[PDB]
Every structure is written in structure tokens, then in C-alpha cells.
Amino acid sequence: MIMISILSLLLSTSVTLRRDMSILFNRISIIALAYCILHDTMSLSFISKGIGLHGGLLHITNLTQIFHIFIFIISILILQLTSFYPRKVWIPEYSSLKDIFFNKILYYRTKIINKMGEHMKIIEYPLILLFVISGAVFLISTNDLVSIFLSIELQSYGLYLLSTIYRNSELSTTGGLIYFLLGGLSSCFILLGTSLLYVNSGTTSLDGLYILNSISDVNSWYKPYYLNFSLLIFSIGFLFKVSAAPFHFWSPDVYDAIPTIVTTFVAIIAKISIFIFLLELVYYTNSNANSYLSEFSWTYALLISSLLSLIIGTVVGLTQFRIKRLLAYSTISHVGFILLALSVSSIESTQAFIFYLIQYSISNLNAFFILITIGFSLYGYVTNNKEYKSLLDKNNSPIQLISQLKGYFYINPLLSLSLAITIFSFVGVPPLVGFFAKQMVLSAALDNGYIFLSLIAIITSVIGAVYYLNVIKEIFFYSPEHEVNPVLNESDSNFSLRILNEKNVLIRSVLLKGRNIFISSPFSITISIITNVILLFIFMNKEWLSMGTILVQILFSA
Amino acid sequence: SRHIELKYPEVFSHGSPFNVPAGFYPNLDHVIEHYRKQHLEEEERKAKKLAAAAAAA
Amino acid sequence: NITLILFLIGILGFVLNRKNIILMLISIEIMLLSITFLILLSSLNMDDIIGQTYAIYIIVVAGAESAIGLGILVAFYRLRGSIAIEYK
Amino acid sequence: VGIIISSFLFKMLPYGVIISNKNDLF
Amino acid sequence: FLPEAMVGRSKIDEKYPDSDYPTLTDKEDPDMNGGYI
Amino acid sequence: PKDAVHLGLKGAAVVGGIGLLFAAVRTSLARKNVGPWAIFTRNGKLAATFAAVGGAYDFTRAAAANLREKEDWVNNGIGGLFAGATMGLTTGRIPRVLGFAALTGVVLATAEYAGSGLRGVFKRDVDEYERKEFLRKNRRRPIEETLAEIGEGRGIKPPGYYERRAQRLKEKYGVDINPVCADPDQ
Amino acid sequence: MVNRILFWTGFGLAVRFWQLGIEMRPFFNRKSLWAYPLFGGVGASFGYWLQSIDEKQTKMLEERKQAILEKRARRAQRQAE
Amino acid sequence: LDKGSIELFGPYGLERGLVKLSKNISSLSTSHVTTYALYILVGFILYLIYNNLLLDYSYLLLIIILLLLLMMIGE
Amino acid sequence: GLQHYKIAMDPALVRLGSMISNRYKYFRWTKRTALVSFMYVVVVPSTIGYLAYKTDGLWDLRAKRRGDLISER
């Protein structure tokens, strides 16, 4: 379905150069990803560790299918930014069902809705995003060494093109260029990792290597040293892409350089797909019996990375004044928690790893939505700060600084509370969902003897809570540097809106001002749902937590 | 579990059909017997469950 | 043995390069070449056509990477005006 | 960087390749 | 490759100055009270 | 018994070898041409501190073990304590030596008492279901076990506290305990 | 007290509340009052769906917990041999 | 004590030093691709060193403390 | 936010409050000052703790009559 959707969308895209089509090509892509959800939902009625598909090259697991569907929902939610206009005009005279379904509202919307904005004029943008999803989902399903390499490339190359699709931005071309170059270094490590596996073992099957590994677990000419340190090189190439330290340096720069609607999808999807792929590898390569092979486990990179990602993520985030550089360092400290749960391989830690990855991906997406919405709200607001005048590419990243958020609770209080709840959920404060995620990973690590990493993580969090609180301190504790626009609210300049009925006949003409201009519903509803999921998780935790209890039971059974 | 069960037990049917030396391929009749037993067992298990529901009607 | 020597040239020609980004993008092409060579030489030793098949697919994606690279490099040059990498 | 990588990856490569780096094999 | 304001140390130095953390010698602050007369 | 002087050099060669490449990376990122032999010109001090901190961690860690002949978590604390104290001496400041001896001293006590998972953790080799079941339903314990733990007295006055207390006082103070009859009758 | 259906009905009402607050639009505007039955009705529809998947999750763990005991019960049986 | 050492060996001291420690690690973020590749190769080297040498984990902890606390030292 | 009564704010008193407020920023480690911090934070509580440990369970008055001892250990 995703492949039919790419080919069909590409044929329609290839016979048009009309930039007005970008909004409708994005709306059709959301319809396409909804069919993919209906198909992977139908495929969920089997209990199995894995079923080889297509000549052994691909596999399907309950974990593989629940993760494709999650990627599809997340993609539908990110695709909304390019599918609907940011702003809106709302009047009580146009607010009933008969009004919405049988009346029309005519007015000059070109400036109010930013019809000709850059996010609304890239025809191929949904198409390149579908290719990244195609690569992401194929990687979760990869069962061969060759399949892994092609799938990570199909995911990576599209992220390079998305990072560069704003071609008139010197900031995106630079972010795109850094990411392509250093990710190409990352892939050369991944190719070396796979190449050493096939060269020492004669097989491209992951299923064959897991069998060789399980026999070699006993308790003289061909000791299987290659598996642990071929997998080590293979692993470093994936720690670059999830931006786990000490391979993290690119992500603050790239995420800060590319536009914010783009940094939303590029900073979230690669992690879900890569972490799920590594989970099956870590389970099937663990030597239950202590052995010489155990002393050299490739998974110690993951602990070293999780250790480093905790210190690096929270400390370097202390003196970040740029909101996108802050969001990326917050991610490097959260991937440390993810890595720690991935390195302790146990039922409790696999439940914790699965819960943490889904909740952080919805929470980091809320953070991006609030950020994007806050910088679309500043349309009827004006500032006189020299710093806010000296910024670069203000159209692609409307909010670039933490200080730009100073006094936002006095401009829009509920959106500021929504960002407070999301940030407090990154801290790990109860009874929010992020606390429960952090507690589940601490409980698993404490049970399995990783007492030292648990102590690092708790001390690390208080350090990271410092810069999270400086964000909230900026929202709540000072006064706005932004002022209502004096001419958009002047009581002398008002545009005319006119309400017609089902057949091109006028009903009522209205005169409207800037106070009649609001955020479009698709973004306020999306922020509202994720905020309330985060807020009220304690009353709605049973089905979500049980979904992860069962997947772990299937993976560790038999 | 430390036991790995093949996602793709059909790799036992791989191998080129051309230029085959005589006696090159091993005789994997026991593997086919094992896989037949698993199919018979699962189907037998399944037939003894949908009949209990008929009894519990 | 030429596999390691070639792989080390492309790794340092990528990391120790202080000239320009096309030479950056060239050194990736060298590393992939050395890995393909290791895979091609092993496959002849193990009578495996899969290794040559794997090699051919690393050539096709290595060309896809170099086209995406040269395309991104042009975009960057149009705006920056130099693809020279600057030290001091 | 040259010696450390080369020493590490010399063991990763297999007997099939490291052959032919006064009693030789034929 | 990235602009000085976005990655520069001196820009962080503006937002977090070293002078925000006073360091006096005993010659000027013997009582550790900021030079209180 | 371990050769601390022989060990520490091995400990110095390992850690000091790492600082050698961090020195080489510093030379490469230099913006001015100084030449290949600059590795020991200015960068020599960086590798020397890596060399100094390493072996100073090992000799003292080893020398502590030879002092009493027992292997436990604490020995690594002393060696770590010294390795940090060595870090400060490069800077030349008493607070740094103490601030550093405290930090890396406590780190290498914690990871050695807790078994940092960077080389795995202890294998269960037993029924995990049983171990949790046993620790949860051993709700009553023999009185001897608590008495060995908390002692006796301070409110832990078991049956037989008074009979034994009289004997214990006699063997120490040589006084026979006999409370007064405290009654005109009987 | 948490009824899976009453909560999600209440959940849908609060999304509409939080929406209007973020949008800075008046709560309880009269011509738009239909959105509270609609957001509230959708939340209940989700709650019915969750209730169903919850029934399916109780069984799967009920089967698993039996399957764990049986795996464990027959394991010790061979040990006594 | 109170408005003194208790604060210095505590919140104010951790505040002052942690701010400096993080400015220094931010200093490595020069956004130049060749420097970043060298950082990636160094971490690639050190993970190989840690693994196949079978180093005791204490060296890694000490190396990190030593790096963090030479990153604390300026210049 | 409200306004208060009118006060003869004394700059000497006003500035004395500023220094007491901000004294924490100028503390340094000295031969004297570490000794003061060491006596009152370490030595003194260690002295009480040592005495508390050394005289714990030692005495009990509850109903000790004539001819019996306060001590129990």
C-alpha cells in the first residue's frame, strides 16, 4: 500500500508544476497512510515470534506490525502541518453544522492563511516523506544483511533530501550537507559491519547468524569472535543516526539549521524504526550462559553510549539559548534512557523500552507542535528586540530562541500550560506519563543489578531539569516582549467576510478584525489530545501497558 | 528461551536446481517429518479447542 | 589486505581532508569500493553468487548516494558560493 | 589511527583472504 | 559552515557571562562580603 | 600479593595511551603549522596527565590490596581517590585535589560495590521465580536472626532478658542483683 | 470508580475545552455547543473500542499465565525422576 | 556555613562549575564537518579499544572523569 | 502589587540587606574557613554521633528499685 501510494502520488506529481497542488498532495498522503493502518491492523491476528516473508528476505512480528502502525499514525499527525493552513477566521455566525456543511465564507485569506508560504509550495514534500516511511517500515521487517543496508539507505537518503528540500535556504542546504556527509560516514560503518558478518559466516540471513551464535553458547579453531565485534561496528553506525553520544554532534546543528515543520519528522521517525530493529538483534544475540563471548558483547557500546548520552545530553543543554539546540540535547538525554533499557535485556526492561519509545515520540511531537503553533500565533503580535531582528531564516524557524518565549503565558495561557505539562513530562514529574516511563526503566535496571547506571540517570535528570525549568521560567515568570499589532487591532481597518448558502446566494456580510483570527483547529485539537494523554495517563494506563506486556511475552516465550 | 525457531523454515528448500553433482544435497527427510509433526500438532490442538466451545454451548 | 589499506585511505581522506567537499564525497566512494572488494573476494573463496549480488547492490546504492550528494552540493554552492572547506 | 584500525580489522578478515600476505601451501 | 550566532562560543558567552559569577581576591574582599565597607 | 610497581606501569600504558591520540587529535585540529613533532611539544602534557592519572590509579589500587590481602570494592576507591588527587596536582590547587579525589574516589567505590554493568552483571543461574517468591513469603524469621542483627535491649527485651541480664551485670561489676522486698508484709 | 466509558466521554469533553482555550475562543458559545456531544461522543466510541481490546488482553495474559505455570509445573516433574 | 560553604559546596558551587563545564563542551560544537568526522572516528576508535582489549571498566570510568574534568579546565 | 505605607528607607540599612542577601556569592576556601566548616559540619556531629553510639542502650530507669543499677550494658 505504501509502495502503491508512492507510485500513484509520483505519477500525478510528475505531470504538474502547479505549486497550489502541494496542500492537496499532502491531504491525499494522509488518506494513503490511513489505508496502510487498516492493512497492518488486519494482519494482527496471529501469535508468533516471527514469520519469514518473500523468500526469507523480510519478516513479520506482532512487534513489527504494532510499530509500522505507530509510524503511520505519527506520520499522519506530522503530515497535518503541510495539509492545513496555520491560521483561520472564526465567527459565531459561521459555527453550526448547517453553516459548516451548507454555507460558504468568502474573504481575502491570502495573507491571513499564508496560502503562498514555503511549507505550502513544495510539491514533492509528502512524496519524499513517504519514501522515508517506506524505508523505516522495511527496516523493522528486514531479516537479511543485504535488506538492512538497502532499508537504512532508503530511510537515510530521504532524510538528507528532506533536510535540503528548502533549496533557497542557506541554512537548510548547510544542515542538509552536514547530515548527508556524516551519515554517509555512518553508513560506511554499517556496511563494514554487515560485510564482516557474511565474510566470516558465509550467510546473509540474520536467522542463520542467530543459530550460529546460539550453538557457540556452550558454557577451538573457529571461536566466533566476529559476531560481537562485527556487530559493534554495525552498532556505531546506528548510534550516529539516533544521535546517541559520543556520535551526537551533528544533531544540534542540523536540527537547528533545517526548518521546524521539517525538524519535527526528521527528529522523531528515525529513532522509532532504528530502536525497534536493534531490539530484536539484542534479544537474539544474548548469551544466557556466561562465556568468553559474553565478555566482549557488542551491547556494551549501548551502555557506554547510554552513560555518555546521559551526561552529555543534560550538561551541554545547560547553556543552550536556542530552542532547537535545546530540544536536540533533550533528545540525547532521552535516548540514554532508551539505550539503558535496550542494554538490560529482560522482560521488565523490554516493556520499559517499548513504553518509553512510544511515549517520548508522542511527547517530543507535542513539543514540536506547540513550538510551531506559538510561532504562527505571533502573527498579530509585534516586538522591538534587536536580537529578534538579527535572526536568520525567520520564516523557516519562527521561534529560534528560548527568550522569544518570554511572557508567553500572558499572550496565550493554555498553550503555555500545554508546553509546561509537556516539558514537566520530559523532566519525569508525576503523575505525568514521562514520569512513569522513566520509573519503568529505573525499576528494570534496579532489578537487573545496573545500580550504578540508575544512579547516573537520577543525578543526570536533576541537571537536565535545570534547563527545562529555564524554559518554563521564561514562559511564566517575566512579561511579554511581544505586543498586539497596533494596526491589526485599531478599530478602523476591518476586512469584509460574506456568508453564502448552498447555492451561491448571499446571507450575511460581516466586518472582521484581528481578534477574529485564530489557530486552525487541526493543530489545537492535536495539541489538546496529547496534552491530555500526558496529563491523565494514570486513569487510562491499562490497555497501553498491557499491549507492551503481551509483546514482550511473545518475544521471550517458547 | 535460548532455542531459535526459524521464521523461515523454507530455507530448507533452497539451492540451485542446475549443475547438481550427484549426492551433493543431504537427505533432510527427518526435518520434513519434524515440520509435518508441528503442523499436525497445531491443527490437532486447534480442532480440540473449537469443539470444546461446541460442548460449552 | 588491500581491503584494509583502501578502507583506511578513504576514511582518512574523509576525516583528514582540508580541501573541498567533492573530495569528501570521493572518499566515501573509496571506502564502499574497498568493502565491495572484500565481499567480492570472500564470495569467490566460498563459491557464493550472493556476494557478487551483494556487491552489485552496493554499486547501485553507491551511485545513488553520489548523485544525491552532488545534487545537495550544487544546492549548497548556489547559496554559499564555495564548496571549499575552511580551516583558520 | 592507521595502526589501531588495521590491527583490529586484521582479525575480523577470514583465512580465505589473509592467505598470501619457505613452506608455502598450494 | 553554520552562522556564528547559531554555534558560536562568544554568543553563549553573552547569554551566560563569566562575570555573573564574582571572584574576588582576599586583597579586596577579606571578609567575603563583596567588598562591603 | 600483586606486583604493584609492575602493575601500575601497565595501568599507565593503557590510560596514557588513550591520551596520546587525544593529543594527536589536538595537533590535527590546530590552525597553525607546527609540524609532526609537535605531538610532544605542547600536547605532551595532555598525554603525561593521562599517563600520570592512569598508573597512579593502578599502583595505589594495587598497593592498597597488598597492604591487607583482600579483594573488595574499597581498594578501587583508594586508587581512585589517589588518581583524582593526582589530577589536581597538575592544576596546583588544594580544593581541586580534594574536589577531584572526592569525585573519582566515590565513582570507583560505587561502581565496584554495585558492579557496573559495563562488563555485564552477575548471572542468576537460579530460579528467578523462586528467589522472588522466597524473599516475599519469608514473613516470620527465627528470633535468633533478629537478635544477631539488632542485638538485645533498647526495647528488644525477649523472654529471658532479666535472667541473663542479672548474670551479665555480675560478670562485669561483681554485684548481685536483688530488688528490695518493698513491702511491710511478705 | 474509573468506568472505561465514562472516562473517555469525559476525556473528549476536555479536549474540546483545551482546544478552545489554546485557540483562545469562548467556551460554551451557543451555536457551537454541538461540539461537546461530538467530541464527547467520539471519546465514548473510543472507550467502547478500548473496552473490547481490554477483553482480548485479559484472555491473552490469562492464557500466558497458565502457559507459564504449565511450562514450570512439568519442568519440576521431570526433575523428581 | 549557611550563606557560605554550604552554598559553595552545593548549589552555588555546582551552578558555577556546571555552567563552565557545559560552555566548554559547547565549544567543540564548531559546526564544521571535518571536525565532526574526526570526533566520530575518535569515538569509533575508543569503542574498539574498549571492547577487544578487554579493558577493565574502571579505566573507562576514569577516562570519562578525566575527560570531564579536563573539559572543566579551561583552554 | 499593592502600595504600602511610606518608609524612611535608610540606604545604609538598605545596602546592609543587600550584602547579607548576596554574601553567598563571595565565599572562598581558606585555611581559616575550611577549619570552621570542618569543625561545625564534620567534627562536632561526629562527636555527638560517637557519644550516641557509645551510650546506646546503656541506661534505663524504668522501674529500677533500690539495690539495682540504672545501667543495662
Q: How far is H44 from chain C (nearest CA, A)?
A: 12
Residues of H in contact with C17 (CB under 8 A): 34
Helix crossing, C21-45 with A170-201: angle to 10°? 20
Q: Is the dihedral of CA A525, A527, A530, A531 positive or negative?
A: negative
What is residue B20's DSSP assignment? Answer: P
Neighbours of F159 (CB within 10 A): 7
Q: Does A46 touch chain E (CB under 8 A)?
A: no
Are G34 and A549 a contacting pair at CB < 8 A?
Answer: no
Decide if G10 contacts G43 (C-beta within 8 A).
yes
- DSSP secondary structure string for all residues of I2-30: ---------HHHHHHHHHHHHGGGG----
What is residue B21's DSSP assignment? Answer: P
Helix crossing, F94-114 with F73-91: angle to 10°? 160
Neighbours of F166 (CB within 10 A): 14
Are F31 and C88 a contacting pair at CB < 8 A?
Answer: yes
Q: Is D1 helix (H, G, I), strand (E, B) or coil?
A: coil
Are I23 and H8 a contacting pair at CB < 8 A?
Answer: no
> In whole angstroms, what is the distance from residue C16 CA to residue C19 CA?
9
Residue of A nearest to B13 (CA): A55
> In whole angstroms, what is the distance from residue G78 CA to residue A30 CA?
57
Decide if A154 contacts A131 (C-beta within 8 A).
yes
Neighbours of G70 (CB within 10 A): 10
Cα angle A365, A120, A486; round to 5: 85
Residue A7 grid cell: 507510485
Q: Which helix (H) or strand (E) holds A129?
A: helix A125-140
Cα angle A237, A50, A148; round to 5: 25
Q: Which distant-in-sequence residues (6+ apart) come within 8 Å of F2 by Cβ?
A: F62, F65, F66
Decide if A214 contacts B2 (C-beta within 8 A).
yes
Residue A246: is the preceding peptide bond cis (ω within 30°)? yes
- The residue with cell 589517589 is F82
- The residue with cell 514529574 is A429
Chains that contact A by 3+ CB pairs under 8 Å? B, C, D, E, F, G, H
Residue F42 grid cell: 605542547
Decide if A520 contacts A88 (C-beta within 8 A).
yes
Nearest residue, CB atoms, I27 vs list E26, E32, E36: E32
Please report the beta strands in F65-111, taking only residues with DSSP state E, as ranges in sequence order: none
- The residue with cell 511581544 is A482
A500 forms beta bridges with A104, A506
Nearest alpha carbon to residue A173 among C24, C72, C86? C72
> In whole angstroms, what is the distance from residue H48 CA to residue D5 CA?
8
Which residue ranges form the domains of chain C, and what is each CATH number? 1-80 (1.10.287.3510)
Which of A349, A452, A453 should be substituted to probe chain F, the one whose Cβ sees the most F Cβ atoms within 10 Å? A452
Residue G46's Cβ-side half-sphere holds a number of Cα atoms within 13 Å equal to 17
Residues of A in contact with G69 (CB under 8 A): none
Nearest residue, CB atoms, E7 vs list H23, H30, H33: H30
Cα angle A4, A10, A14; round to 5: 155
Decide if G19 contacts A525 (C-beta within 8 A).
yes
Which of A381, A416, A546 should be substituted to probe chain G, the one whose Cβ sees the most G Cβ atoms within 10 Å? A546
Chains that contact I by 3+ CB pairs under 8 Å? E, F, H
CA A243 to chain centre: 13
Decide if H66 contacts F61 (C-beta within 8 A).
no
What is residue F183's DSSP assignment? Answer: S
Residue A245 has φ and ψ, to the nearest 5°, of: -65, 150
Q: Where are the alpha helices (DSSP H) in A216-346?
A: 225-241, 250-257, 260-266, 269-284, 292-295, 300-316, 323-343
> In whole angstroms, what is the distance from residue A51 CA to residue F105 CA?
51
- The residue with cell 485479559 is G58
Decide if A316 contacts A465 (C-beta within 8 A).
no
CA A333 to chain centre: 15
> In whole angstroms, what is the distance from residue A283 CA to residue A279 CA?
6
Residues of I in contact with E32 (CB under 8 A): 23, 26-28, 33
Burial of residue I22 (CB within 10 Å: 0-12, 13-18, 19+) is middle
Q: How far is D3 from chain C (nearest CA, A)?
A: 10
Residue E22: is the preceding peptide bond cis (ω within 30°)? no
Residue A100 has φ and ψ, to the nearest 5°, of: -65, -40
List Cα–Cα distances, A312 to A60, A100, A183, in angstroms: 36, 51, 20
Spell out the SS3 assignment of A86-121.
Answer: CEEECCCCCCCHHHHHHCEEECCCCCCCCCCCHHHC
Q: Do chains E and H touch, with touching meaning 3 or more CB–CB pairs less than 8 Å apart?
A: yes
Decide if A134 contacts A3 (C-beta within 8 A).
yes
Nearest residue, CB atoms, C11 vs list H33, H34, H41: H41
Are F28 and C16 a contacting pair at CB < 8 A?
Answer: yes
Q: How far is I71 from chain F (nearest CA, A)?
A: 9
Residue A224: is the preceding peptide bond cis (ω within 30°)? no
Burial of residue A419 (CB within 10 Å: 0-12, 13-18, 19+) is buried
> In whole angstroms, what is the distance from residue F185 CA to residue A244 CA?
88
A52 forms beta bridges with A59
Residues of A in contact with B7 (CB under 8 A): 49-52, 56, 59, 143, 207
Neighbours of F186 (CB within 10 A): 5
Which of G9, G17, G22 should be substituted to probe chain A, the one whose Cβ sees the most A Cβ atoms within 10 Å? G22
Bridge-based pairing state of the strands A87-89 and A517-519: antiparallel
Compute the 3-state secondary structure of chain I and give helix, strand, coil in percent, each to the nearest 5: 55, 5, 40
Q: Is H40 helix (H, G, I), strand (E, B) or coil?
A: helix
> In whole angstroms, what is the distance from residue D26 CA to residue D22 CA?
12
Residue E4 grid cell: 556564528
Q: What is the identity of the amino acid at C25?
A: L
Are F53 and H66 a contacting pair at CB < 8 A?
Answer: yes
Q: Does A253 touch chain E (CB under 8 A)?
A: yes
Q: Does A303 touch chain F (CB under 8 A)?
A: yes
Nearest residue, CB atoms, A177 vs list E1, E6, E11: E1
What is residue F50's DSSP assignment? Answer: H
Q: Which distant-in-sequence residues (6+ apart) come within 8 Å of E27 by Cβ?
A: none
Q: Does A451 touch chain F (CB under 8 A)?
A: yes
Decide if C3 contacts C37 (C-beta within 8 A).
yes
Q: Does A14 touch chain G (CB under 8 A)?
A: no
> In whole angstroms, what is the distance from residue H68 CA to residue A245 CA?
14
Residue A105 has φ and ψ, to the nearest 5°, of: -125, 115
Burial of residue A461 (CB within 10 Å: 0-12, 13-18, 19+) is buried
Burial of residue A247 (CB within 10 Å: 0-12, 13-18, 19+) is buried
Residues of H in contact with A304 (CB under 8 A): 47, 50, 60
> In whole angstroms, what is the distance from residue A237 CA to residue A198 CA?
17
Q: Does F25 touch chain D (CB under 8 A)?
A: no
Chains that contact D by 3+ CB pairs under 8 Å? A, C, F, H
Q: Is A512 helix (H, G, I), strand (E, B) or coil?
A: strand
Burial of residue C75 (CB within 10 Å: 0-12, 13-18, 19+) is buried
List Cα–Cα distances, A540 to A268, A433, I56, in angstroms: 24, 10, 51
Decide if A340 contacts A453 (C-beta within 8 A).
yes
Nearest alpha carbon to residue A303 among A338, A271, A343, A333? A343
Residues of A in contact with C75 (CB under 8 A): 164, 167, 173, 176
Nearest alpha carbon to residue A258 among A168, A163, A123, A190? A163
Decide if A517 contacts A499 (C-beta within 8 A).
no
Q: Does H19 touch chain I (CB under 8 A)?
A: no
Are A253 and E12 a contacting pair at CB < 8 A?
Answer: no
Q: Which distant-in-sequence residues (6+ apart) come within 8 Å of A343 by Cβ?
A: A282, A299, A300, A302, A303, A306, F117
Torsion region of H54: left, alpha or beta (phi above 0 gives left; psi -120 to 50 gives alpha):
left
Nearest alpha carbon to residue C45 among C88, C3, C87? C3
Residue of H nearest to A329 (CA): H26
Q: Do chains C and G touch, with touching meaning 3 or more CB–CB pairs less than 8 Å apart?
A: no
